Each structure stands twice: as C-alpha cells, then as structure tokens.
C-alpha cells in the first residue's frame, strides 16, 4: 500500500541519502535473489537484517519508495527492475505477518471474501483439489479456503487455476494474497507511468541530477 505521496519535507540530504539506502535494499533483493532461493530464514532473516538496519522506518520506507520512483520511471528496464524487487519485498512483509494482523489488512481492504466451513469444504474439496495447479496431493490440507467474486479472481480463473461455482471463486488464502500482489504490481505500474509523465517538470532541477543518474 504505497499510495498517497509523502507530503512532508526533507533536507536535500534526507532525499539524497534515502535514495542511496533504497537503491541498496533493492540492490540487496538483487543479492538475496540469485545467491539464495526463498530458502526460509536464510533468505529471510538476511533480508530482515538489511530491512531494519538500512532504516525501513515506516515513514522512512514510504518516502524512500516514492523518491526512487522519480529514478526508475524512465527506462522500462528500470520500471520492470524496480517493480520487481519492490514486490519480493512486499511478499516478505506479508510472510512474517501473523494470522491475526493479516486478516485485518484483508478485511480493512475492500475485497469481499468469506471463509468456508468444513461443511462446504469437504463437499467441494473434490472440485477444489482438481481446479488447483499441478498442486500434487489429493488433500485439501488444513489451509482454509475463501469464497470471492469470480471477477476478483480474474488472473486465476482465466487459466482454470481455480474453482468457480455460481459466480464465486473458491481459493486458498495463499491465493487471495497472490491476487492482492498482482493488484499491487498493476497499481504501482500505473503510478510509475504518471510520474514519468510529469517528470519533465522536474528534469531541469539540479538537486535531482545525482538521482536521475
């Protein structure tokens, strides 16, 4: 949820610094990316040692992010690169989060979903298990499943990676998030587009040359 640009003001030093700090964090998402794998805590804790150390902190991550937009909103390689690491980071931020607080961001969000009781769960377990990916096994595990409007699951059902029944998609909580993430990539991309759009009214400024280069 990196919307609403920071209206605060900061020294050219704050700016100048932050940028480099982030260019590092994402640069680190570049390191922890090809040197490891999502190998639990190794890839995790290592990433979360950079996290706090490098600063981000919430209000810091906020500003940091936006300032870097001015940076990578030019070359597509950047926009793809920036949106890239920026995502792996947002996932990480979820991973850790506990079941309690996770549920809040879901609700507090707008997505209208529900959790199904073992009632409908076993009844549809059969279908659900068949809709899924190559997801080996025939057990609908213990991970609860939700009932959300079929449209909201667009990226899932268009590839028959989920069960539709009566205009509803029945997905695991692993998938609801996966949806929210693509929604992120998308919304963000719309933003980098708009920034680049009005970048010109900022090219000329000298304080911003280190950054844009």
């Amino acid at each position: 949820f990196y919307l609403q640009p920071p209206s605060e003001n900061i020294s050219l030093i704050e700016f100048e610094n932050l940028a480099i700090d982030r260019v590092k964090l994402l640069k680190s998402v570049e390191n922890l990316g090809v040197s490891y794998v999502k190998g639990t805590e190794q890839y995790q804790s290592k990433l979360e040692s950079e996290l706090r150390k490098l600063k981000f902190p919430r209000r810091r991550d906020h500003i940091s992010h936006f300032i870097l937009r001015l940076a990578y909103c030019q070359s597509e390689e950047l926009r793809r690169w920036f949106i890239q690491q920026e995502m792996d980071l947002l996932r990480f931020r979820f991973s850790i989060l506990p079941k309690d607080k996770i549920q809040d961001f879901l609700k507090d969000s707008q997505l209208q979903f529900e959790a199904i009781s073992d009632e409908e769960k076993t009844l549809r377990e059969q279908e659900i298990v068949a809709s899924s990916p190559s997801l080996s096994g025939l057990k609908l595990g213990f991970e609860s499943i939700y009932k959300i409007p079929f449209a909201d699951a667009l990226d899932l059902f268009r590839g028959r990676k989920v069960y539709l029944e009566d205009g509803f998609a029945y997905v695991p909580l692993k998938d609801i998030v996966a949806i929210i993430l693509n929604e992120f990539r998308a919304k963000l991309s719309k933003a980098l587009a708009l920034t680049a759009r009005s970048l010109p009214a900022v090219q000329s400024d000298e304080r911003l040359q280190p950054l844009l280069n």
Binding site: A130, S131, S134, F150, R158, R160, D166
Partner: protein, 389 residues
C-alpha cells in the same frame, strides 16, 4: 421449405419491418425497464442499407423512433452495440475522449466454419443435420458454464440465420463487465488451441479441471451418434489416420490393423479405447474434445463496443430469421425448419393488428423471447423491491 429468392428481399423487408418485427418486445428488452438514465437512448445500432452502404452510430429516443426509422430505411442488416456515455448519433457533439462504450451484454458467436477440420458432412459455409449436433453441444457446454460456473442467469441464445448461434448474456451485473474479465471468461471456456495448422489441438494434464470434466460428459452423451454414426470419423484410412495423428505413434500400427479388421466406426472406436487404455496404463477425451468442443472467437466477446447481429434480423442469403433458441428443447432445435422472411410474409398475406406475428410461424419464437423477458423483469423486481430493503 421453399428455396428462398433473395431478389424479393426489398419488398419482404418492407413488409417484415412494418408488420412482423417484434418491436415492443425488442424495446422491452433493450430498455431493461427504465431503471437507468438513457440506457436505451444511449444504445448504438448499426445498419447495412441499400447498396450495402454501412451506417453505424445510429441512436433512438424511444420505441417509436426505432420503428419509424427502421421502416424508412428497411435495413438489410441490423446490429446492436454498446451503451455509450452520450447518445451515439451526437458523437460529433461530444468532445474527444469523452465519448465511450460503457455497458453491453457479454456475447458469444459460434460458427460452423470454425470446425471445418472436424466435419466430413458438408462444405464450409454450409450445414446439415449431420453437423448441427456440434451447435447443440456448443450451446450446452457453454450455457452450462455461464449458468453453473459464473452464475449468469439471463442467457438469450439465438440462431445466426445460416450456420451458427449467438449467445447474449444480459445479467445487469454482466453488462458492466470489463473487457479484461470478458477476455478472461472466454479463456476459461476455451480449450482447442487451434494453432498454425498443428494436427493435435487438445492436451489434458493428469489433473482435470471440473469445467473440462463436465464438458467431456455432455459430449459423451452425443459422441457415438454424431461422431461414429453421422460423421463416421473412422470410416477410412484417410479418416482414421486423421484420428491416429492425435495419438502417440507407438500405437499406430496396432490400431491400424484393428481398424483394418473392423466393419464400422463404432467398432474401431471401441478398439481405440481399448488399445489407448493399455498405453495410458486421457488420449480418448482429448479426441472427443478436439472434435466436439466449441471454438470461440475471443474478439467477439472481448470488445465492449462490438456490434453483433441483432436478434430477429433477416439473413440476406438464407432468408432465415434470427430466432431465439429455446433451451428447454435445444436438441429439438432445427435450423432447417426456421421461418423465412418470405415464408412468414406469405402466411401474413394469406390472412390495427398488433398480434399479426402471432398468426405467423414466428409466434413460438417470439414466445421464447418473452419468457426471457419475463425473467429479466423478475430479477429486476426481485433485486430492487427486495434488496433495496
């Protein structure tokens, strides 16, 4: 029925458009109940006139405009488009980038020529009783998904007038779907990957999504009669090689013999199942699907501004009327007994009026359209009167 003479079209159309076109019902539908600003007034119609001139951003104020105008222009073709931000005909009046397609029923179009590689009966633009079963299977496979999967309740299936059918999903919620979603609905229903001339076109994975399964089932219920008896897909070497092609080469020669020692397709098919079963220990289902599963054109359904053939319009060549198909008796639907504009004009001749169409062979068809309409009214009355509470 008597072979239709397209030369009489100009006169027939005039009659047809002044005494038989179900105007009031056409209006009742497109106006959806006055529950919206200018939902009708902002609906775009397209026409194909005289020398095949093509007018397009046509619009109308009320049902009376629609009648007056149509009768004056006696359209050879009438197409329905989206509901716009401004009356279509005043697009010269609207700014640039302000005029936009906002709402429109989800539509599908199924054409027999999209199966020319899986039929031995007729030639491309034609159809006979031996290939029409495909339209039967298409309507059932697609209408089941739209109803059971997506929860769409209002689906108007219509005969194209020559060799195919159209489906108009009208759920108030559906008329608001984004192209991205429509494009997705189509991908969800699509299964035959008709590549640049690639023999095999269907591949199942160990796992089978329920939509595919329920589809296979429906097909199963017509495969033998349609494929084995009517199409006789395994009648010759020139025919079964075609099916052998969709099977792992390590099995060709064996079956090639069984086929050779058989007398009919129902037999050979049974060998194919047997042999393929050993090997497997899905090859079967894939073949049925590649021969019977619908081929949908993503373009027709993706665009929210797409102009599609209007129900009750007249087909220039076949003369047949684009009539609503009755789902409760789909299998019974017969393309060849579908009233001709000529045929119905004659019935009328051999006889205000306002119930003229009822004395014609259109009667049953307009009846179907009315039930379709009665249900719209319900859902509407249901939702509002009971949910605005």
């Amino acid at each position: 029925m008597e072979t239709f003479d397209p030369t009489e079209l100009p006169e027939l159309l005039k009659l047809y458009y002044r005494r038989l076109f179900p105007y009031s019902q056409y209006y009742r539908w497109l106006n959806y109940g006055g529950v919206i600003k200018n939902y009708f007034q902002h609906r775009e119609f397209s026409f194909t006139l005289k020398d095949d001139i093509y007018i397009r951003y046509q619009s109308f104020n009320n049902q009376s405009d629609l009648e007056k105008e149509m009768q004056k222009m006696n359209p050879y073709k009438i197409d329905i488009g989206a509901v716009y931000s401004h009356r279509p005909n005043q697009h010269n009046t609207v700014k640039l980038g302000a005029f936009q397609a906002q709402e429109k029923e989800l539509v599908f179009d199924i054409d027999m020529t999209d199966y020319d590689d899986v039929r031995r009966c007729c030639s491309s633009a034609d159809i006979c009783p031996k290939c029409w079963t495909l339209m039967t299977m298409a309507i059932r496979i697609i209408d089941r998904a739209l109803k059971e999967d997506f929860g769409f309740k209002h689906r108007l299936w219509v005969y194209s007038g020559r060799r195919g059918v159209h489906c108009w999903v009208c759920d108030e919620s559906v008329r608001k779907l984004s192209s991205a979603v429509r494009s997705g609905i189509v991908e969800y229903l699509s299964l035959v990957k008709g590549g640049q001339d690639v023999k095999k076109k269907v591949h199942l994975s160990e796992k089978i999504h329920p939509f595919i399964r329920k589809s296979i089932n429906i097909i199963k219920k017509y495969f033998e009669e349609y494929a084995l008896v009517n199409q006789d897909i395994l009648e010759n070497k020139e025919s079964w090689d075609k099916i052998l092609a969709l099977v792992p080469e390590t099995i060709h020669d064996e079956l090639q013999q069984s086929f050779q020692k058989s007398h009919n397709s129902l037999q050979r098919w049974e060998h194919l199942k047997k042999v393929a079963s050993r090997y497997q220990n899905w090859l079967e289902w894939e073949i049925m699907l590649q021969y019977c599963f619908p081929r949908l054109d993503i373009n027709v359904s993706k665009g929210i501004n797409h102009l599609l053939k209007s129900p009750f319009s007249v087909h220039p060549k076949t003369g047949r009327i684009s009539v609503p198909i009755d789902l409760q008796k789909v299998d019974q639907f017969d393309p060849f007994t579908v009233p001709t504009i000529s045929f119905i004009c004659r019935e009328l001749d051999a006889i205000h009026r306002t119930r003229d169409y009822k004395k014609t062979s259109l009667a049953p068809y307009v009846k179907v359209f009315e039930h379709f309409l009665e249900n719209l009214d319900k859902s509407r009355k249901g939702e509002l009167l009971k949910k605005s509470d």
